[PDB]
Amino acid sequence: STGSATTTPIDSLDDAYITPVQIGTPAQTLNLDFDTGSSDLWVFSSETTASEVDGQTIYTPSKSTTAKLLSGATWSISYGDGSSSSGDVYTDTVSVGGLTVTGQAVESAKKVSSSFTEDSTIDGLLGLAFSTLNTVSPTQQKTFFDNAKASLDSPVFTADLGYHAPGTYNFGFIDTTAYTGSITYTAVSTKQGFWEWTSTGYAVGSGTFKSTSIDGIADTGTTLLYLPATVVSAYWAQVSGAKSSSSVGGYVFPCSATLPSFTFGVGSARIVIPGDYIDFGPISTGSSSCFGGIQSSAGIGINIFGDVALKAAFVVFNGATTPTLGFASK
């Protein structure tokens, strides 16, 4: 089997991407944030504290003839950006782009933190990291991908995120028309539950490539590119007027600037992030100070190849017995 679904930016800055997902019988379609940095499939639901729902589409398990409450199971998750959610668990039928899993754990939110409430466009998350990170207790549950894997033509899914445009998540096959040149594969550590890999270095604009190992995770659920302070300093040094602002919470730059590109290494291959991808617009409405899309990972504790990086590539998440990551230009 295979599946193929279109993923769409939630706003004009590509702050996140939503992908339609069918849950239950008859189908209830929710727009979920596919997140290769976590492993819970959770949804706004009929059980969510009413004051914490503001425009989201909810899953109502009582209206699904295939929904079954998973007795005694609960979940609770906290994300790197400080957001959180919790609730109970059903199993139900879940389909993505034509690909169907029966008995998928669907984590129904009773509580969500303010940032989820405030984002009416995201109805929940669909985790695609490794199932070892799944928070369901007392019996940990598997991800959609994990459940689908054995049925797939090939045990892979791919992320093809667009810049200010729709893109695609494919399951079970590699669309050879979706990228240019070849796919370079690179080793993955699953030790922390992430799609963790080591970049071979970077360049800023037309500058020479610096060979240096940068360990980080491929994380579709993180907006920005978080890299070591040395790297980030070298990037923003090429932007006139750029500075790190503690009050704003990262590097800012004059909105009139033309940003240089940023290149990262995948083995001997190179992925080029155009400068425009690194512009996240005015820090506040009407400001001529703009927020940078490359930020320091110091005090995150891990480097994160988020959407800013991944949307410059066609990315293969290879779930073979020994997982690997593939990157191609496009």
From Swiss-Prot:
Reaction equation(s) it catalyzes: Hydrolysis of proteins with specificity similar to that of pepsin A, prefers hydrophobic residues at P1 and P1', but does not cleave 14-Ala-|-Leu-15 in the B chain of insulin or Z-Glu-Tyr. Clots milk
Superkingdom field: Eukaryota
GO molecular function, one term: aspartic-type endopeptidase activity
Keyword annotations: Aspartyl protease, Disulfide bond, Hydrolase, Protease, Signal, Zymogen
Disulfide bridges in this chain: 255-290
Peptidase A1 domain residues: 17-328
Active site, renumbered: 35, 199
Listed GO biological process terms: proteolysis
E.C. designation(s): 3.4.23.22
Family, as annotated: Belongs to the peptidase A1 family.
Protein name: Endothiapepsin
Species of origin: Cryphonectria parasitica (Chestnut blight fungus)
Gene symbol of the encoding locus: EAPA
Residues represented out of the complete protein: 90 to 419 of 419
